[PDB]
Coordinates of C-alpha atoms in Angstrom, one line a residue:
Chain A
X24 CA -125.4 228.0 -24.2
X25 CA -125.3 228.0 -20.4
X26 CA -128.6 228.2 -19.3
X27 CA -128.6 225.0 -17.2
X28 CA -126.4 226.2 -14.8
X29 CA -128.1 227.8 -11.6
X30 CA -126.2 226.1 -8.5
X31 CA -124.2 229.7 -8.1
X32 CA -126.8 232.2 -9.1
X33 CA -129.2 230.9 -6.3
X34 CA -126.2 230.5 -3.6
X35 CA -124.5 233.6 -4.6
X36 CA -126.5 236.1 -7.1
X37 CA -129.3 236.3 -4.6
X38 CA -127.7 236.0 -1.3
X39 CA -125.6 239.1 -1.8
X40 CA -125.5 242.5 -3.0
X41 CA -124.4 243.1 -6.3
X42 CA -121.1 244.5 -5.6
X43 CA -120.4 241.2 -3.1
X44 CA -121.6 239.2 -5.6
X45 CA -119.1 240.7 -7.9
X46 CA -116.5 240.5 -5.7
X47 CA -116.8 236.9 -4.9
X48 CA -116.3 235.5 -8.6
X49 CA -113.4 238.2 -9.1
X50 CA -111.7 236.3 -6.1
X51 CA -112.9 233.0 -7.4
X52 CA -111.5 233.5 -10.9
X53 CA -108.0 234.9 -10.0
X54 CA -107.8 232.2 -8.0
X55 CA -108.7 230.0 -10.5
X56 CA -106.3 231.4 -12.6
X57 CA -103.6 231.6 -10.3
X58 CA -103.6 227.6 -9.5
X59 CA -103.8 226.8 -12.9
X60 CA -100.1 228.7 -13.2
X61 CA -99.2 226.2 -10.4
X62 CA -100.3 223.4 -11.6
X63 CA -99.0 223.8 -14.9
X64 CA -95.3 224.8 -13.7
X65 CA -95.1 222.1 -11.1
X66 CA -95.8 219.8 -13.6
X67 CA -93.7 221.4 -16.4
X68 CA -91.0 221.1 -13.7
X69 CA -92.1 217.2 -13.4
X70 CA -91.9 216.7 -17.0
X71 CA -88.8 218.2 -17.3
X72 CA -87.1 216.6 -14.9
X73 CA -88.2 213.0 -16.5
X74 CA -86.9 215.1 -19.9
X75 CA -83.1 215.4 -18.2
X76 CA -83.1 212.1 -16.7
X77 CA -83.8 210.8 -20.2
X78 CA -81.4 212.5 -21.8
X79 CA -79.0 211.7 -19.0
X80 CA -79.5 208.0 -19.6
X81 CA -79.4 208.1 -23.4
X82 CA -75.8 209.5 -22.8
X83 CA -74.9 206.7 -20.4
X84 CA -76.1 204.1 -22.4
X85 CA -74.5 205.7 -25.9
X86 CA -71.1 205.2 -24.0
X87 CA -71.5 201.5 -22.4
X88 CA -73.4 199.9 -25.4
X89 CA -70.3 198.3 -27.0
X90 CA -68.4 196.1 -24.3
X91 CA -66.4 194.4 -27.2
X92 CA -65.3 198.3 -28.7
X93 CA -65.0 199.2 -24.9
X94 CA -62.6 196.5 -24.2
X95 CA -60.7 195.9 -26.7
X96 CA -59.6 200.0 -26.6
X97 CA -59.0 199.0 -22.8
X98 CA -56.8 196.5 -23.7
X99 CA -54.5 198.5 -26.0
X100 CA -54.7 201.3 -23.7
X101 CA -52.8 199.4 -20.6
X102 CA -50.9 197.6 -23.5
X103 CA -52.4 193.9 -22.2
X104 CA -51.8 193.7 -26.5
X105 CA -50.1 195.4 -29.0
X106 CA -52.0 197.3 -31.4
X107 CA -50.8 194.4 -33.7
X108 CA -51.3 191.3 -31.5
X109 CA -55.0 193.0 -31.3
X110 CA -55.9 192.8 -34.8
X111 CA -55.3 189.3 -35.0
X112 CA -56.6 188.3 -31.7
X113 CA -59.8 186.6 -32.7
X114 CA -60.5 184.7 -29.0
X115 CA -63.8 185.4 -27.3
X116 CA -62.9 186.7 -24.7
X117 CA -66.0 188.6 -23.1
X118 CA -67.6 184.4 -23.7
X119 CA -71.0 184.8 -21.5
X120 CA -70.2 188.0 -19.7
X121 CA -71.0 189.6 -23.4
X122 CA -74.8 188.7 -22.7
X123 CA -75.1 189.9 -18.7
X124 CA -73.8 192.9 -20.2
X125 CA -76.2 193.7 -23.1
X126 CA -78.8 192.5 -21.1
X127 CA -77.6 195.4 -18.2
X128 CA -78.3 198.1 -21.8
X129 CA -81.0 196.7 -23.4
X130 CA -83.2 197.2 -19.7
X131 CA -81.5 201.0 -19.7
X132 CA -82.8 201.3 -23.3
X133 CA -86.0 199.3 -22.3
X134 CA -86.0 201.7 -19.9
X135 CA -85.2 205.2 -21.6
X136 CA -88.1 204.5 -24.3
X137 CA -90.6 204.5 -21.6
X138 CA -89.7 207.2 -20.2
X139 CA -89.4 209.0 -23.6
X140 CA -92.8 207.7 -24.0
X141 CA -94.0 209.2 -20.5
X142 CA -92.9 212.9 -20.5
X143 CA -93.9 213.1 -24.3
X144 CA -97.6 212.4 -22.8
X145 CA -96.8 214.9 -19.9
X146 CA -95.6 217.4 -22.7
X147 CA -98.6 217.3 -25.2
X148 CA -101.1 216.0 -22.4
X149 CA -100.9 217.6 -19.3
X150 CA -98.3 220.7 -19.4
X151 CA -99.9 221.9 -22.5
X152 CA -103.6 221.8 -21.2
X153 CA -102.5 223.8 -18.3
X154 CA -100.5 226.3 -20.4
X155 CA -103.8 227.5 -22.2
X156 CA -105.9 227.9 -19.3
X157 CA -107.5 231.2 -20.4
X158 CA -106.1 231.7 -24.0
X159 CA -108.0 228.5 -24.7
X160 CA -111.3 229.4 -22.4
X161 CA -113.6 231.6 -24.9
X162 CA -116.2 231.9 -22.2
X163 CA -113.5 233.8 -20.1
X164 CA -112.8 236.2 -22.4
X165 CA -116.2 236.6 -23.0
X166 CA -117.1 236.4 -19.2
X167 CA -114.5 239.4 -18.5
X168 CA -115.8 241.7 -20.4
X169 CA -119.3 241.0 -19.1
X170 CA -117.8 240.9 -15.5
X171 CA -116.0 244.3 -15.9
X172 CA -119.4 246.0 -17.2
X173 CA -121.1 244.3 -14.2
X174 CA -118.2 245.3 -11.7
X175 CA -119.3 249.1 -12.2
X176 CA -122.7 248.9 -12.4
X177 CA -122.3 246.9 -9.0
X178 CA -119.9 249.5 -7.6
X179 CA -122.1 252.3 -8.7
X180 CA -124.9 250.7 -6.5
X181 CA -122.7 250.3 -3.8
X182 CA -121.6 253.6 -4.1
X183 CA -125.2 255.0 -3.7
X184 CA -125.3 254.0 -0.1
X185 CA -127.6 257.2 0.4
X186 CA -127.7 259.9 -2.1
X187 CA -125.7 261.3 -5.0
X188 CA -125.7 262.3 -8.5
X189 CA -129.3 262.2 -9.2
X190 CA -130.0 258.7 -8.4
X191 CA -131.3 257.9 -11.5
X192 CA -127.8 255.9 -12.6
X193 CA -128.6 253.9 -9.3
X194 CA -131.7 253.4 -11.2
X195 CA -130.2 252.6 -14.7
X196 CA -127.5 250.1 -12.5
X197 CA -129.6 248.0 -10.8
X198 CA -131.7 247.2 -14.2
X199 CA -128.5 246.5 -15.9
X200 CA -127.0 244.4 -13.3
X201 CA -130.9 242.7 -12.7
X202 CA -131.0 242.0 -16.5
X203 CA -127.5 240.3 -17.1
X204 CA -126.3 239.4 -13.4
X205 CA -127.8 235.8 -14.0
X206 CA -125.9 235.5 -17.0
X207 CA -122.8 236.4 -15.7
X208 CA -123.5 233.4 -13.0
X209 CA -124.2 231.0 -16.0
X210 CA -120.5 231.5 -17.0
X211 CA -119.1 232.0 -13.8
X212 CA -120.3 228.4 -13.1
X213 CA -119.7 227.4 -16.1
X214 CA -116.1 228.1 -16.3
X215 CA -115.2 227.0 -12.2
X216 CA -116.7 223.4 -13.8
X217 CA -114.6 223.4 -17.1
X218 CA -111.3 224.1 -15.2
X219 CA -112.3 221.6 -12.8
X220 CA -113.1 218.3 -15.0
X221 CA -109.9 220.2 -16.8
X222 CA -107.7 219.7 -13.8
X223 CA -109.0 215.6 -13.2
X224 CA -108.5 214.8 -16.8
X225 CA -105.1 216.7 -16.9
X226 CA -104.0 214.9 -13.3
X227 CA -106.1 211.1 -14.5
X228 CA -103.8 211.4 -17.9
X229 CA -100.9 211.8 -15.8
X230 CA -101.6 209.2 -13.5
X231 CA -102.6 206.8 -16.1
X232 CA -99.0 207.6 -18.0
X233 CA -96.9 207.2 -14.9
X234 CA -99.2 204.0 -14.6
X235 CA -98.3 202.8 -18.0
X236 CA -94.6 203.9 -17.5
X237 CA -94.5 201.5 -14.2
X238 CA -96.4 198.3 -16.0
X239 CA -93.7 198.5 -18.7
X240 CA -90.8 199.2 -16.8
X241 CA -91.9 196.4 -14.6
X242 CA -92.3 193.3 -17.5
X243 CA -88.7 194.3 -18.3
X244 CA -87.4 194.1 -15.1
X245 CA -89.2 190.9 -14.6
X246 CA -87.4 189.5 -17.9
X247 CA -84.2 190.8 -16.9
X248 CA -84.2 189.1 -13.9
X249 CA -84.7 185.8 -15.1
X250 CA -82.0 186.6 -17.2
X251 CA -79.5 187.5 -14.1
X252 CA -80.9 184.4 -12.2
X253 CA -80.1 182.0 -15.3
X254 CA -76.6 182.8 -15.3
X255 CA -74.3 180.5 -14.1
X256 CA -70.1 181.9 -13.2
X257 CA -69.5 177.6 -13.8
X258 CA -70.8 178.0 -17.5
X259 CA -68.4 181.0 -18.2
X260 CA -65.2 178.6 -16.6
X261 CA -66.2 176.1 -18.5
X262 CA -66.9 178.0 -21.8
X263 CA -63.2 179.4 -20.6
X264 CA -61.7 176.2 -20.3
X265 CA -62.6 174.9 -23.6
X266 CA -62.3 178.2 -25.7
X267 CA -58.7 178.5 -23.9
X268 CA -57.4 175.0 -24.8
X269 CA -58.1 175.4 -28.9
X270 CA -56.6 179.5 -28.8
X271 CA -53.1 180.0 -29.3
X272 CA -52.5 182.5 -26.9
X273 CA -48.6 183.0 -28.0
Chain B
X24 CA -57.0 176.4 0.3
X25 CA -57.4 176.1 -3.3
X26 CA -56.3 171.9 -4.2
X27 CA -60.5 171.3 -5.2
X28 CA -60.2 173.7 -8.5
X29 CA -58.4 171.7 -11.6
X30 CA -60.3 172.3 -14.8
X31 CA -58.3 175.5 -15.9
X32 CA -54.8 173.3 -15.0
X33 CA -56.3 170.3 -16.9
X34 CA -57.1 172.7 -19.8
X35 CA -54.7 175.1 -20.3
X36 CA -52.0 174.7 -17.8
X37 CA -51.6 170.6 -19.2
X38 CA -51.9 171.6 -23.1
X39 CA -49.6 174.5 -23.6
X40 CA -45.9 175.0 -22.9
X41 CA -45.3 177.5 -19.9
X42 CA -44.7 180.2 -21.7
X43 CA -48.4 180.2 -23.6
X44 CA -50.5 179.0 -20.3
X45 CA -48.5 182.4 -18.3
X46 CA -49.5 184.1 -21.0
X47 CA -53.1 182.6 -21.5
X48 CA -53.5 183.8 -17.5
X49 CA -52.4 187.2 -17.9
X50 CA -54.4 188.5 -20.3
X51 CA -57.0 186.8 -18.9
X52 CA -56.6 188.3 -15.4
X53 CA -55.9 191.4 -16.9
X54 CA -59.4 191.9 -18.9
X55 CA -61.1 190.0 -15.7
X56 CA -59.6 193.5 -13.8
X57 CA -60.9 195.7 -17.3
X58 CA -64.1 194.0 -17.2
X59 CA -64.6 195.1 -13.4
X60 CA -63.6 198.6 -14.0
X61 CA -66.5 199.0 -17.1
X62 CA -69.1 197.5 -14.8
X63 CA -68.3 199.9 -11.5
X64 CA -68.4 202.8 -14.2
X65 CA -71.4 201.6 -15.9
X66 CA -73.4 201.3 -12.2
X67 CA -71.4 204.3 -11.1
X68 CA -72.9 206.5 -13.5
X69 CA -76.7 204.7 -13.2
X70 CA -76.4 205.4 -9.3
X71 CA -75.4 208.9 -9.8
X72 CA -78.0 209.6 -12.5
X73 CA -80.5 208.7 -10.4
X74 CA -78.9 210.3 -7.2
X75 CA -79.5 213.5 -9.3
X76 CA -82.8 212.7 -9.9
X77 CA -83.4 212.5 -6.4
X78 CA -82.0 215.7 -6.1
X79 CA -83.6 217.5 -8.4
X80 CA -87.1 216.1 -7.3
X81 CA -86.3 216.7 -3.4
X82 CA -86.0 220.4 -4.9
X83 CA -89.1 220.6 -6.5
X84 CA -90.8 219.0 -3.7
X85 CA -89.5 221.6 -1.1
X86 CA -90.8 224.0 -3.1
X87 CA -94.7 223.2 -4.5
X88 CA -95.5 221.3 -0.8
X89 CA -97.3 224.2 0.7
X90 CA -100.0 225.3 -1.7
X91 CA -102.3 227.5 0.8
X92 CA -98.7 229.4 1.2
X93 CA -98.0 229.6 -2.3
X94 CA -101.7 230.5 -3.2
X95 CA -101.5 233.6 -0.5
X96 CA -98.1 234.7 -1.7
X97 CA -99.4 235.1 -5.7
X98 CA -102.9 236.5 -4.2
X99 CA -100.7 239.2 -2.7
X100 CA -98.6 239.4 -6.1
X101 CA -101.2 239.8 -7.8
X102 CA -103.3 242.3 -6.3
X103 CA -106.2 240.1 -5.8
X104 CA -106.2 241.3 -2.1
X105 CA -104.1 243.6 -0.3
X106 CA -102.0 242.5 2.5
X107 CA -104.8 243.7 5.2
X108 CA -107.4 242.0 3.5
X109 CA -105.6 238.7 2.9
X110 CA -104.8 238.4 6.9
X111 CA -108.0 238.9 7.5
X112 CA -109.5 236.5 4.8
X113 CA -110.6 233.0 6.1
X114 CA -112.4 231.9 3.4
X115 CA -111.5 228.2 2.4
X116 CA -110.1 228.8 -0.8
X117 CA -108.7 225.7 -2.0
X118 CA -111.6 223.4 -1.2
X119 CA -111.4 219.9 -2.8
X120 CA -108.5 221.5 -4.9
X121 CA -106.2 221.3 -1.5
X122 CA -106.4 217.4 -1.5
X123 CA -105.6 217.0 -5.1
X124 CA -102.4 219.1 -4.7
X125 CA -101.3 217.1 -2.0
X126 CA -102.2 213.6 -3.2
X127 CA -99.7 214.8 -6.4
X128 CA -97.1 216.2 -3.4
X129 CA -97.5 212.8 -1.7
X130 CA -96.8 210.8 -4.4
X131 CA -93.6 213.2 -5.4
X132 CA -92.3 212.2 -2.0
X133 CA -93.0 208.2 -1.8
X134 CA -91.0 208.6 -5.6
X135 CA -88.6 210.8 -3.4
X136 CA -88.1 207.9 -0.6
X137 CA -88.6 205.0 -2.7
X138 CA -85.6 206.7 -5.0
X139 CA -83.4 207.5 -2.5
X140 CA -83.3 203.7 -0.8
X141 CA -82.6 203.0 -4.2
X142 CA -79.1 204.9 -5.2
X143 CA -78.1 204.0 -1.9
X144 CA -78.7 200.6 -2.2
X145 CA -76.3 200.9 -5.1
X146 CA -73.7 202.8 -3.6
X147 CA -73.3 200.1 -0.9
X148 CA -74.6 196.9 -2.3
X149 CA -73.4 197.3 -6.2
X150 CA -70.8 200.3 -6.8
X151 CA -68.7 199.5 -3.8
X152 CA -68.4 196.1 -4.3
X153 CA -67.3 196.5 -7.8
X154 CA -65.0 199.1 -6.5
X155 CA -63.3 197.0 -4.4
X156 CA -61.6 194.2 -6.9
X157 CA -57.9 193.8 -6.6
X158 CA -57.6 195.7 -3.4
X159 CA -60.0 193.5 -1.7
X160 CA -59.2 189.9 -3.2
X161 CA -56.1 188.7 -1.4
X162 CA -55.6 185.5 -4.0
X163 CA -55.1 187.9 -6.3
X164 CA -52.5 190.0 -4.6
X165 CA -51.1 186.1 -3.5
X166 CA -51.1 185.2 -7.3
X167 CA -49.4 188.3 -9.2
X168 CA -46.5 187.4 -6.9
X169 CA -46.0 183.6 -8.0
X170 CA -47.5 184.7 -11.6
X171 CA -44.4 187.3 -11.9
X172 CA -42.0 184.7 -10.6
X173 CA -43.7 181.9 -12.7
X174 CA -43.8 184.4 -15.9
X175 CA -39.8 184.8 -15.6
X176 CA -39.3 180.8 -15.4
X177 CA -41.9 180.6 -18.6
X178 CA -40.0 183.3 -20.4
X179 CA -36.4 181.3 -19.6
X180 CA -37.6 178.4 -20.8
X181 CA -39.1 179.7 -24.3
X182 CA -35.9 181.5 -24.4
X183 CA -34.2 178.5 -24.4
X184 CA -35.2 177.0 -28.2
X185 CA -32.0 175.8 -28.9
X186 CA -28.7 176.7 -26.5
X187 CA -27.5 179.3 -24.7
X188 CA -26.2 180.3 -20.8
X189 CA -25.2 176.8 -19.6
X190 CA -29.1 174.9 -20.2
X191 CA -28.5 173.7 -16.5
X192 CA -31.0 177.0 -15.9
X193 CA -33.4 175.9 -18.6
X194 CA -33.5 172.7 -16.2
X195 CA -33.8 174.8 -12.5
X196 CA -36.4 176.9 -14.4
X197 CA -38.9 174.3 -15.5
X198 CA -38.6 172.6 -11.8
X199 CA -39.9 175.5 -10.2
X200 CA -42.1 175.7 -13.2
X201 CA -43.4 171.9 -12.3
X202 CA -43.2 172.7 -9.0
X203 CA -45.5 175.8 -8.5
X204 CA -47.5 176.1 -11.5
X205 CA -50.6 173.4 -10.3
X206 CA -50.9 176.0 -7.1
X207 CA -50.6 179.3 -10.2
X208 CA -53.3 177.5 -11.6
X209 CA -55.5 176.8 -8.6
X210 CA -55.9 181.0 -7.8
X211 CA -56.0 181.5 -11.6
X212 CA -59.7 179.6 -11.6
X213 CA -60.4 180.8 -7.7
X214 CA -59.6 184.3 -9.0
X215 CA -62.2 183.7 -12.0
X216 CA -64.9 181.7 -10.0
X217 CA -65.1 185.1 -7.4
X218 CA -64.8 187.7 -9.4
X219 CA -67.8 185.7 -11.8
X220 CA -69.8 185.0 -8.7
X221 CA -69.0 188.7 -7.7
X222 CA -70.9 190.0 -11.0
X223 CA -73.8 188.1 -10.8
X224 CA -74.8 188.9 -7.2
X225 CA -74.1 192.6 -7.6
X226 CA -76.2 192.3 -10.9
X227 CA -79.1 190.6 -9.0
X228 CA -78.5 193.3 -6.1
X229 CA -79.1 195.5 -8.8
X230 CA -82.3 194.0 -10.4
X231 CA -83.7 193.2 -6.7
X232 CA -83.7 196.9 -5.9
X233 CA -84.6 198.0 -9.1
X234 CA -87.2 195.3 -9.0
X235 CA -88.2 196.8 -5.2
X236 CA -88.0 200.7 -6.3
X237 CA -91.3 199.8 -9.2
X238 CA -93.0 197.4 -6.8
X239 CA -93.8 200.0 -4.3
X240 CA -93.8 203.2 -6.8
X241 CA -96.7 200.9 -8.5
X242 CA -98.6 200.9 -4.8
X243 CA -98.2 204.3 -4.2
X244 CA -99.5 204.8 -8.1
X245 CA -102.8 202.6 -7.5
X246 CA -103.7 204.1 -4.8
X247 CA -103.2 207.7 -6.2
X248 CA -105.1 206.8 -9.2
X249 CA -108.3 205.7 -7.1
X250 CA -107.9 209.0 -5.0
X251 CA -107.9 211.2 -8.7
X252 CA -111.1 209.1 -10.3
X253 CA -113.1 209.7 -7.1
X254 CA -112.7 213.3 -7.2
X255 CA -116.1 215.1 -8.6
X256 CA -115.7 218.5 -10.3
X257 CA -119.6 218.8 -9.3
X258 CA -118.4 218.2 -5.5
X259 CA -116.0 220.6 -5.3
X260 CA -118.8 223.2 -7.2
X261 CA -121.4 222.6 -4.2
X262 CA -118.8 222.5 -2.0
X263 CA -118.1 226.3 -3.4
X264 CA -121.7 227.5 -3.2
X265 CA -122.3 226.6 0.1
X266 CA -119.4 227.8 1.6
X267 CA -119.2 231.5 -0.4
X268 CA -122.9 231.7 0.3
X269 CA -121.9 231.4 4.4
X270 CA -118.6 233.9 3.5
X271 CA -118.8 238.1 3.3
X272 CA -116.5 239.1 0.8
X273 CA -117.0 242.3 1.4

């Protein structure tokens, strides 16, 4: 029921004639309607370019994942060994470079699940709530049948600005537009403060999924980075030096 | 100069007979240059991915910014007023809604900016310097010289197991070997020590802007979220009646 609802009734209903009246939530509802469509394709545009990036960087990461696969094809394909000399080259030769590299992937994975994780939420939580802005809404089918009905009485009144088929339909209109008029408003209000708190939920989940996207990204960026920092080139020439002097190289 | 560096000579060059330590340096030197072309591919691609991404998002900026335009352009679409009564209308349409819009727009555009500092940080501080590898170290154009020579005195001297073209060449060839092959073996570890060094500051350049791009995307998404949660559906409905109830829609 909507019976609580009175704010546009008393500022509207009964400020205006009835075909004003009319006229004003037909202009409000379109446009209600209307920037619904743009929120919803802006941010189907949004969540589809996180989509594409995503897949983008599932691509990239597919192809760099395996620096030992990477280089040893490298190595065969500018002949630094023969295909035989390669299958019995057992020296480490990536030695600490191996983990600066993996750590490089695991932050673009780190990276592509959260965002995997953030247009999923945009998908299901925010695109799809603003794809069923009126197929959802059973008071706006309901309130457009009721407008519509309305509209003409309204326009009938309107139309009687002095005299014309015996006024007895300006009569009959004004009763039916006095007896369900206030009703109308109930819903007219009542859907302007669905698609509203609609909207704020719809933009707060985004928000709050950007914001988790962010937080996540962030820890693993901060992990990474300690990583980077504990790295040492002096380690690698010494981890060289000593792996060097037990390989036979010949 | 090069005289401080000796662990590689003390290592390799001192435990292995010519032949093995020239051949212990070139592969070596060879995956060092491998190594350099996966990680400029790697960060070539990650700066171009999100080069696009800038892109795309500078696209759909340009193109939801103006909402009262875009609002008036679908009014017209749509019938909702004709082109008379839509230059004539004044009414404020949008209301609260107009804020909401832009405070999404906004944030688009700090992503936009705070993305765009980012690729080109790595195209100047990351991609280029990996780009720039062989071309740009002069030891190592200095070293493939003497390495080639050195190589040729290695490969005499392992030719020479037993007897062949009067030894007195086995002799000349492991004086310039003795001769030159402390100095090989000076660039060999300067040529390892920068090109290590090399990685791990273009890594940290990496995670420092990285780590800058989230630390002020995460600003710009605080202060967007307390903008969303003080927005009142019930404001923007008052907001509504007064204003209609002061409009003529007629």
């Amino acid at each position: 029921m909507t019976e609580q609802r009175t704010k546009y009734a008393d500022s509207i209903l009964t400020t205006k004639s009835p075909y004003e009246a009319t006229e004003t939530i037909r202009i409000r509802l379109s446009q209600v309607k209307l920037l619904n469509k743009d929120f919803y394709l802006l941010f189907k545009e949004l969540a589809n370019l996180k989509r594409n990036y995503a897949q983008q960087l599932r691509k990239i990461i597919a192809e760099n994942e395996d620096i030992t696969k990477i280089l040893n094809a490298q190595m065969i394909e500018s002949n630094v060994l023969t295909p035989q000399e390669m299958s019995a080259f057992r020296f480490n030769s990536l030695g600490e470079l191996r983990n600066v590299w993996d750590t490089v992937i695991e932050e673009l994975k780190s990276d592509l699940k959260s965002s995997t994780e953030y247009y999923n939420t945009l998908d299901q939580q925010v695109v799809r709530e603003l794809k069923e802005s009126v197929e959802n809404n059973t008071s706006w089918r309901e309130s457009k049948d009721l407008h519509s009905k309305l509209s003409k009485n309204a326009a009938s009144i309107e139309h009687y600005s002095k005299n014309n088929e015996n006024s007895s339909h300006l009569e009959e209109a004004r009763r039916q537009w006095d007896q369900q008029s206030p009703y109308l408003f109930e819903l007219f209000e009542t859907i302007d403060y669905n698609r509203l708190d609609t909207l704020k939920n719809c933009m707060l989940r985004f928000q709050t999924s950007f914001s988790d996207y962010l937080l996540n990204t962030t820890k693993e960026c901060e992990t990474v980075m300690t990583k980077f920092l504990a790295f040492e080139p002096q380690s690698e020439i010494d981890r060289f030096a000593k792996d060097a002097s037990q390989y036979n190289f010949q």
